């Protein structure tokens, strides 16, 4: 359990992915050319988890950039850290997906998927011991939603005993592009229930609300939304990337955070929310607050199955344990009493850029059903009148596949409610 292979699919996945590589390269002291110019070594210790070592002390990301149209991937190469990526890891089509799950999954994406798997296999063969894969993508579009879930299924066929991790961006009417996003999301959620170990639910509704309320931005761009995501992605991968006292790989995270196979859709959080010094009680209070959650769900409307906190910066370990147990013991109604010791805490000395200290939250709450209900209602509103189905049935699908995906997500909601009342 050493190397991780990153994949990024579609517009959202590549833009979020590019920001993730900006942040962690800066933390690990890797400049845009790929050269290490850093002060500490607590940066190179587990650098090979996300980077390969080429000759001349060059550190190149173990990343694969995927899209069905070249526009967004050309923008990544033109961007600040576009030099660092392997040029032959850019796998791109010309046609585009048209925000259609069917085009990404069945017709247009099926052409390109073998070329991606060749790069995945080329990267996986050179690994000393592959942990698994992490994917960044949206569920509202075509490529990242459709082809990303196709990639997940194909990667599982070839690597069935490796961990499959995802950073899935959920659609919302507040930051919506197309009206067919509930179809695309419902189809993808059904795929993610089967073929992933760990999914981080990054709701655009929450990211918009965090930018609009607090932070206080009247007009948030995708860059403002992605600032929160790249901060979160840095936070949750901290134990994988640095030598924290906690022993840390993707399988151990899955073993402890996932009590039941289908329930692996986590609710991330972050503090402080950024765009000057914060204490341990204030961090602990913020990360558990509903206003700091990256999924638009009140955790007070459900119960925590498992929780995973990651404090970053040089602080008192005693004060962390007191404050975590303060929050935990005195809000004990919102934790399940049938999984003892279900909140764990890790501490890393190196903080993120431009913060003295921070705290990242990872929660397997039953309140995540609110997110899936919201998409189920948006789905069913349109599906009961067969609205916009001609886009999908024109690509060879039929109504039965939609009916199944709807039933499967409603089962998932029903399953979260089953364990909430226990």
């Amino acid at each position: 359990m050493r190397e991780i292979v990153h994949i990024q699919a579609g517009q959202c996945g590549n833009q979020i992915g590019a920001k993730f590589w900006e942040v962690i390269s800066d933390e690990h002291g890797i400049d845009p050319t790929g050269s290490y110019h850093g002060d500490s070594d607590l940066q190179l210790e587990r650098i090979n988890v996300y980077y390969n070592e080429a000759t001349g002390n060059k550190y190149v990301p173990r990343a694969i950039l995927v899209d069905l149209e070249p526009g967004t991937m050309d923008s990544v190469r033109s961007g600040p850290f576009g030099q660092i990526f392997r040029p032959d890891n850019f796998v791109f089509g010309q046609s585009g997906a048209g925000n259609n799950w069917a085009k990404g999954h069945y017709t247009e994406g099926a052409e390109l998927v073998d070329s991606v798997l060749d790069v995945v296999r080329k990267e996986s063969e050179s690994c000393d011991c592959l942990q698994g894969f992490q994917l960044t993508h949206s569920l509202g579009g075509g490529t990242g939603s459709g082809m990303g879930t196709l990639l997940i299924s194909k990667i599982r066929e070839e690597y069935p005993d490796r961990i499959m991790n995802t950073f899935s961006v959920m659609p919302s009417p507040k930051v919506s592009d197309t009206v067919v996003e509930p179809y695309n999301a419902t189809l993808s959620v059904h795929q993610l229930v089967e073929n992933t170990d760990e999914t981080y639910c990054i709701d655009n509704e929450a990211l918009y609300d965090i930018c609009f309320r607090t932070l206080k931005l009247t007009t948030p761009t995708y860059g403002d939304l992605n600032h929160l995501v790249s901060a979160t992605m840095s936070g949750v991968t901290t134990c994988l990337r640095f030598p924290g006292q906690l022993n840390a790989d993707l399988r151990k995270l899955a073993v402890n955070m996932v009590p039941f196979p289908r329930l692996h859709f986590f609710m991330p959080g972050f503090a402080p929310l950024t765009s000057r010094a914060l204490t341990v009680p204030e961090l602990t209070q913020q990360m558990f607050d509903s206003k700091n959650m990256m999924a638009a769900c009140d955790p007070r409307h459900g119960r925590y199955l498992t929780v995973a906190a990651i404090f970053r910066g040089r602080m008192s370990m005693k004060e962390v344990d007191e404050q975590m147990l303060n929050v935990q013991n005195k809000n004990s109604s919102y934790f399940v009493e049938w999984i003892p010791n279900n909140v764990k805490t890790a501490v890393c000395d190196i903080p993120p850029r431009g913060l003295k200290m921070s705290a990242t939250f990872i929660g397997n709450s039953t309140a995540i059903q609110e997110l899936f209900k919201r998409i189920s209602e948006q789905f069913t509103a349109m599906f009961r009148r067969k609205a916009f189905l001609h886009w999908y049935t024109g690509e060879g699908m039929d109504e039965m596949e939609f009916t199944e995906a709807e039933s499967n997500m409603n089962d998932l909601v029903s399953e979260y409610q089953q364990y909430q009342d226990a």
């Binding site: 996932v258 009590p259 196979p261 370990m317 999984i339 003892p340």
Partner: protein, 439 residues
């Protein structure tokens, strides 16, 4: 002379292994490189210390030890550290990917691929023993390797080395230490599979070691290095009788004879004192009366329980340093009347006492203080059952909902094995009841 091979399984086993063999080296005057100036017999001699150390013609003193872990980073610290020259590379064994805090993965999936390799390296050590006694197995209850692979090894050691003794040093899980959430499963699965195959098992609750480091050494947040150095003192006090010349606990079978009347009931409660801070640079030396008194306080035990509500089957005192029999007899008589020491009806209510005049060595610049007399009390009490009851309750809470079971079933284990293992712990709890009360 009769040898003793020490096996170290998983992270906890290896890192505690480092603490023990570091200490052993300082106690015998063995240097990092392996030279022992005190040893005049080169390449042999069969002294009391040779039970743990073999010798080469060059004058290197090599631990009779095998370090095993399913991932390399922990054993790599042994290979890179101060005592790399101590161990021959064949002793240090590492897998690629680890057991992920899963008993089933460590036992069945990954363990099966590495078990024949580990027994071969043990056989290499065993072939160079004139008169082997048995084994000392260091591991964790909570860890996937420590639970899973250890139980497989303990099964295979009963086949391959049938008549030999097998002693356990087990690290019992504590949420202060940050465990996994599924360690209650791993603890009960490995205990079930190992129960028939282990002769004597010294449980060490990390909660007790953590709180002793907090309370006595005045540490804000004890690291593993703090815990292991404290634990290694207790291991040293237990193993001292094998390594040094004396006439008590002098062979591993005596631990079994003295402490274990019922074969299943083989979990003695260790109690060590004094634990003193190095910041207290001049401290007022504790007498034999005081440290023997400390052996009946719950604060100084290795497992947190109340011996007052239970019954002693055997009690055994291992003094180290400036002690004589008169001091111990005077201390025992004073303690007799004060404390409520209830023994079982069908056992002699006595204390088997051992003194080794060489006082407890400490690691230079360590948090522990150098003292002139210390004691470790090994006592088979029914109050240890409390530890099983806590752990069995944590199991029942999760297993009532089948929580985390799919991870074990996914590695080939069955749901029957959970309830099998649980019913054996239910039987074990009942065995402590039958022995520990009048009705």
């Amino acid at each position: 002379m009769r040898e003793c091979i020490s096996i170290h399984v998983g992270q906890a086993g290896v890192q505690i292994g480092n603490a023990c063999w570091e200490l052993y080296c300082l106690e015998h005057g063995i240097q990092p490189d392996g030279q022992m100036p005190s040893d005049k017999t080169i390449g042999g001699g069969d002294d009391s210390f040779n039970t743990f150390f073999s010798e080469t013609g060059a004058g290197k003193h090599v631990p009779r030890a095998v370090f095993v872990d399913l991932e390399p980073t922990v054993i790599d610290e042994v290979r890179t550290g101060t005592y790399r020259q101590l161990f021959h590379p064949e002793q240090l064994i590492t897998g690629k990917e680890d057991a992920a805090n899963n008993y089933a993965r460590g036992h069945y999936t990954i363990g099966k691929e590495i078990i024949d390799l580990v027994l071969d390296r043990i056989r290499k050590l065993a072939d160079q023993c004139t008169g082997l006694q048995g084994f000392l197995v260091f591991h964790s209850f909570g860890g996937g390797t420590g639970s899973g692979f250890t139980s497989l090894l303990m099964e295979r050691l009963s086949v391959d080395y049938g008549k030999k003794s097998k002693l356990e040093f087990s690290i019992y899980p504590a949420p202060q230490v940050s465990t996994a959430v599924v360690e209650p499963y791993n603890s009960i699965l490995t205990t079930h599979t190992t129960l028939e195959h282990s002769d004597c098992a010294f449980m060490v609750d990390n909660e007790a070691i953590y709180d002793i480091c907090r309370r006595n050494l005045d540490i804000e947040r004890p690291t593993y290095t703090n815990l292991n150095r404290l634990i290694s003192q207790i291991v040293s006090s237990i193993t001292a009788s094998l390594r040094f010349d004396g006439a008590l606990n002098v062979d591993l079978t005596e631990f079994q004879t003295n402490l274990v009347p019922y074969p299943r009931i083989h979990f003695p409660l260790a109690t060590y004192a004094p634990v003193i801070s190095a910041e207290k640079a001049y401290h007022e030396q504790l007498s034999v009366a005081e440290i023997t008194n400390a052996c009946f306080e719950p604060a100084n035990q290795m497992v947190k329980c109340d011996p007052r509500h239970g019954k002693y089957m055997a009690c055994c005192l291992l003094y180290r340093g400036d002690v004589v029999p008169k001091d111990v007899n005077a201390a025992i008589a004073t303690i007799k009347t004060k404390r409520s020491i209830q023994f079982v009806d069908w056992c002699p209510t006595g204390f088997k006492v051992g003194i080794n005049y060489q006082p407890p060595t400490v690691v230079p610049g360590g948090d522990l203080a150098k003292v002139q007399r210390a004691v470790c009390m090994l006592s088979n009490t029914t109050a240890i059952a409390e530890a099983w009851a806590r752990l069995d309750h944590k199991f029942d809470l999760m297993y009532a909902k089948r929580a985390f079971v799919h991870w074990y079933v996914g590695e080939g284990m069955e749901e029957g094995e959970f309830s099998e293992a649980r019913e054996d712990m239910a039987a074990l709890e009942k065995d402590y009841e039958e022995v520990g009360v009048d009705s």
